[PDB]
Amino acid sequence: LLHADTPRLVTWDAGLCTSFKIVPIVPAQVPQDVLAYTFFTSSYAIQSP
Amino acid sequence: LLHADTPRLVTWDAGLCTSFKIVPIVPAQVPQDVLAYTFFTSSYAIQSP
Amino acid sequence: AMSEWVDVFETSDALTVSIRGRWMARLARMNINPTEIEWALTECAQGYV
């Protein structure tokens, strides 16, 4: 055994390196001219950042 | 009836016109930077020749 | 087929990034290589092993 009260120095994060997040305070839904992207018979929805 | 012991000359092959095939002798799996192709929300896997 | 390290663009925040940047450095400076360990442990032994 290794009894020493050793500190964990090496640690990893596979996620995003950010500490601030943008949130909605007052929701809303508005009409739009374009509703989605289409490819042949497929159709993908619009995802905003 | 047609009794004659007639030979089959005309025959067809819709497959591949090759007679040699490449095989794996010793398998292996290695880590890669790229894992697949992505299109909008779809994602296709990488198929090697 | 995987790279030992990589630089990528992606959502994140300069502050957090900058911090982990220094944390990186600090650790890296603490590096040792086995050869050094050989010398250390051996010298401690006062020459019996």
Swiss-Prot record, chain C:
The chain holds residues 443 to 491 of 1275 of the full protein. Belongs to the orthoreovirus lambda-1 protein family. It is found in: Virion. This is Inner capsid protein lambda-1. It comes from Reovirus type 3 (strain Dearing) (T3D). Coiled coil: none annotated. Homodecamer; each decamer is made up of two conformers of VP2, called VP2A and VP2B. 12 homodecamers assemble to form an icosahedral capsid. Interacts with protein mu-NS; in viral inclusions. The gene is L3. Inner capsid protein that self-assembles to form an icosahedral capsid with a T=2 symmetry, which consists of 120 copies of VP2, with channels at each of its five-fold vertices. This capsid constitutes the innermost concentric layer of the viral mature particle. Displays NTPase, RNA 5'-triphosphatase (RTPase) and RNA helicase activities. Helicase activity might be involved in unwinding or reannealing dsRNA during RNA synthesis. RTPase enzymatic activity represents the first step in RNA capping, which yields a 5'-diphosphorylated plus-strand RNA.
